[PDB]
Amino acid sequence: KKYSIGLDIGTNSVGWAVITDEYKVPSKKFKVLGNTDRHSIKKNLIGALLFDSGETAEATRLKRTARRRYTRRKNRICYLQEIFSNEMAKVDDSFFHRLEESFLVEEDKKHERHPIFGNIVDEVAYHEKYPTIYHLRKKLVDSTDKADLRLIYLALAHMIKFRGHFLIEGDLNPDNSDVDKLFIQLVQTYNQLFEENPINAAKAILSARLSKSRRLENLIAQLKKNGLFGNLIALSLGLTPNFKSNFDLAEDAKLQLSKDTYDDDLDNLLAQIGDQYADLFLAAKNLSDAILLSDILRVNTEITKAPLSASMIKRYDEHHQDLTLLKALVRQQLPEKYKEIFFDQSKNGYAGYIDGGASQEEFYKFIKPILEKMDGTEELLVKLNREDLLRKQRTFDNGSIPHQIHLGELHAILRRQEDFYPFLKDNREKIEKILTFRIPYYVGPLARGNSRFAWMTRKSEETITPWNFEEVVDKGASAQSFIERMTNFDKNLPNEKVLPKHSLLYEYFTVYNELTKVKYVTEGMRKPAFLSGEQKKAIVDLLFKTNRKVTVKQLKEDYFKKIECFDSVEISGVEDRFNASLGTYHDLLKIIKDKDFLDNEENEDILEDIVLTLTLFEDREMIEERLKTYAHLFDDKVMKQLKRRRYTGWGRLSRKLINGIRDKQSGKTILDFLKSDGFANRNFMQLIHDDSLTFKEDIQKAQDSLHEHIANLAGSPAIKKGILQTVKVVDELVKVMGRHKPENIVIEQITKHVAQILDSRMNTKYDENDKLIREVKVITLKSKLVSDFRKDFQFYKVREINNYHHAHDAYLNAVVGTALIKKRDFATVRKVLSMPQVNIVKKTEVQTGGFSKESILPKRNSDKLIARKKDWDPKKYGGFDSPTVAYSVLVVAKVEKGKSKKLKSVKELLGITIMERSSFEKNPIDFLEAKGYKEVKKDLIIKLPKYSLFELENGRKRMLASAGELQKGNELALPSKYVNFLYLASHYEKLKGSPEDNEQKQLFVEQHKHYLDEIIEQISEFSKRVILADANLDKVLSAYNKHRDKPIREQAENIIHLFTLTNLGAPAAFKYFDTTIDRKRYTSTKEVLDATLIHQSITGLYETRIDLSQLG
RNA sequence: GGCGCAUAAAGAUGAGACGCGUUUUAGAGCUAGAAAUAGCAAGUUAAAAUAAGGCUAGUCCGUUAUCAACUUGAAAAAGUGGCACCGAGUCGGUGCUU
DNA sequence: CTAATCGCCAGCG
DNA sequence: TGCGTCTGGCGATTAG
């Protein structure tokens, strides 16, 4: 018999149904293997399948990059120690040894506990002399005496370990340090350059803690937005720039100094308007420098050389003095809340700030009403209102510090002490290279083959220190392979790489493809005609070689005086402007300035290589090294202006698809047929589908399992899981029907890929004409159709009752698609929409991910603390807790339960965590007997992943969730009249239909009132049978019996809220009217060792029962 | 249904870097008493680790995706379960057949 | 001398 | 013969 399959896809659910021709659902009995006595089970062919949602890979990329950064930081400190070791060995031998075991407790140390100086009096003398590290940095920068070697190492290691960002470009110095002098200098040189209308006329006018747009508004309004001065102000502040109509150039190009391509961009935009304006943009960049050094560096730059250390010690001394002032004020005026502020670690006072765990914002919010309701707090409220009160040094807002500040302080320290230590003067540039070096973003991970993310290549066989980096890795080939490993292959000749977007061949192809299918009508012509090859040649040689953006008005105005000799010409086929344009031709004509050289056909490859070289590389020395092979072709100024050009973009076709293959009947190419065709003017995607030329056979002569094709699809990783489960389910239930392929596959992006993969997987036979025999038929539907079919005949759906709605919607879209294709049945539909047996299957899975929670808890006496290293005991060092279990094992053996080591055959669960599962899979009996068990049964070990299944007495079903945890497994089968009554009573206000029909429905709801009591009886019987949660059941029945006088709609909403008591899955909480009923959690797995484990198939039709009472 | 060009929004994938946060230790607490405790001074910083670890020993890799049971296999993979009819509280019964 | 139950918590800009 | 497509772990507490 014929049969059809219907599906309904989601991101957490797949619903499947099998119908015959008369819209029924075939029941069938199945063979059950195992150890019990049930050997046949009658089941219906309708069901669903549930799984948790898939995850993307963004959460695991950041951890990988963080691991790489921590490894490289440790290696930086190792390089510095390897430098200082030989000179440190003469003054204090075990200094690095004391520095590297500082974490251990006093028992586990092997030296003195004071790491820096060894003894105790030198340690307290050092800590009284320098209260922070910044006092030491200012003392080493400013003074001129020979300091101790350990203090120099400590300062250098502190400024290498934390070294600021690299977002600024070029170089800078803190010599400016003034927002007023630079602004006056910029106004002076603007009045020197432009003298027709000068600037109308500092520190706090541009250094406010507000938005950049409002800062630009109050800075420009006090003295327009389309002005050159205003846009230069927005460029210096860092806002969105524009240079379209102010400079009046020929190309609308912005200029943001924060981005990468700015210096060559400024050098290109300089000569486009004049040899002037150089010192103007230099002063604008210097103002953009000095505004960034304002809000982070507030100190007199003439008093001290190192400004950051001075700013830090200013903040520290300010904190100290207003701490003493606040202590005196709170002790005097309000002597009752003193212990709450300066002693209590629980609240958000000062003790919660420093010693507790409070932030700055919560501390200021707590201390605001205390500081307001007092007397004598005038400056403190101002400092709190500008958020500079009681501040720390290492804060959350030091992300603005550039690396040049630490570089300048390091250079000053190395310049000051180099006379007393010779090897410091010998190795200054080595340590400066240690600080300043970073791996470029196109080289990548410096592997040696065993990575799967690396692409770099080497030129030698040695180790890559930061000093010999440029003489080991080839940077040109690595920077080429960084791009070339990601670009698309051609979708017609899959052994060829695509062209750059701005190559001249690609632009010729697009302009001839757009050109050759346009039509024109003159005054007196009969029919619209195409253009000849001479006409297209005149279009290319005259128009497109001068102006890029061509409107149709320019095309009409050119030839009507020029060559057309006709004024009543309408050009049909083009909407008011073109799309393709020879932009690279125009740019190289502005650069190279020789039209006859670009017109020569013998220079095609030698220029397309230049376009490829300008598309790939970004570093200027690489482009110079790869354009040095063209030195005897142009002038010096041409090569000087040539490497400033930069392009980005990759097209869709290869060079072989436009100039490589040949039509063997005629000997011409595709591009030649675009240029000169004949009296057809055919184009691309018409010249390869025609059977005249040989291009169809050539593209056909240039040509994967299920998982590889699923991974070859494009989308979020949730829908890949969804369509893979869909394909597995439909193949399984094709197999279960005697291996007869179905007739119709009705489905409901999700659909647009599964339709193609199902049509490719089902139909495989060919006819005598080598045509695809449509043995099946894949039909796709829209959701509004099944929604209208649900809502017009009162087939109402309530989402919160159970999980049968997936399978019921699958069956419903199946029957409406089959009845639509084909054209007392409603009795059959209402009969099968109340079947009490649907195969719901939660997909079991082995859990994986992180090892535990990431919070590092402090020490306590308990033994649920996972150690953080090998030799760090958790009772003395803290550690993580709450690990995640991968799967459980069912073990049965003897354990030493007795003072005389008495044996006792026990049987229990055991959670294997994610951290130790490899050691369990390697040697199971040795690890399991090191756990504490003895004399185990080597064959009776059963794996149990998350979401297993267990059948109990009277139909009780529980799903395993952890070592000790269970979840509800059964599903409530409510009759259809109660579902219709609940949907109608829930939607009492929103009618959405006919008003007289709504009045009849309201009279129906008013006629049926005891259905609430019947539903309460139903769910109380169900919860007394399978849930065993009598306390919360008592609470909800008392809450129903109390407020049993409400309106019908509010009562219906409160009833359909409380179905979270009985539905499948994890327990949750709910609220009836005001009483909130907490979730009840089953935390015992003692009963589960006397039940029947069910090994269930993918659709749940094949089963394998296992009686666990017969084991052990 | 699928391509090419033009404009726009959204998202994915892969590198390179900053700043915090957390845990132990070091920053000698004083005074009155026999303590239990009380008043008192303080406080801003640093070292180390940041998934346990692995061998292929790299300035590399370690949280993504795939996964019911049983039988072959190193693996990709392959194979393993009768059909109608009457009914329905999580599926039951009858007949034919092996 | 052990099992249920209540309440809290979970790396980020 | 042409036409549109949050839920599990953990401590404190209580029940026994």
Place this chain on the structure above:
DNA sequence: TCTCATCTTTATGCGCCTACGCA
């Protein structure tokens, strides 16, 4: 939090290409 590179999809405008039921 910041810099960089390559892809996909969705929506309008402009050219066409081909399977397949229905007018």
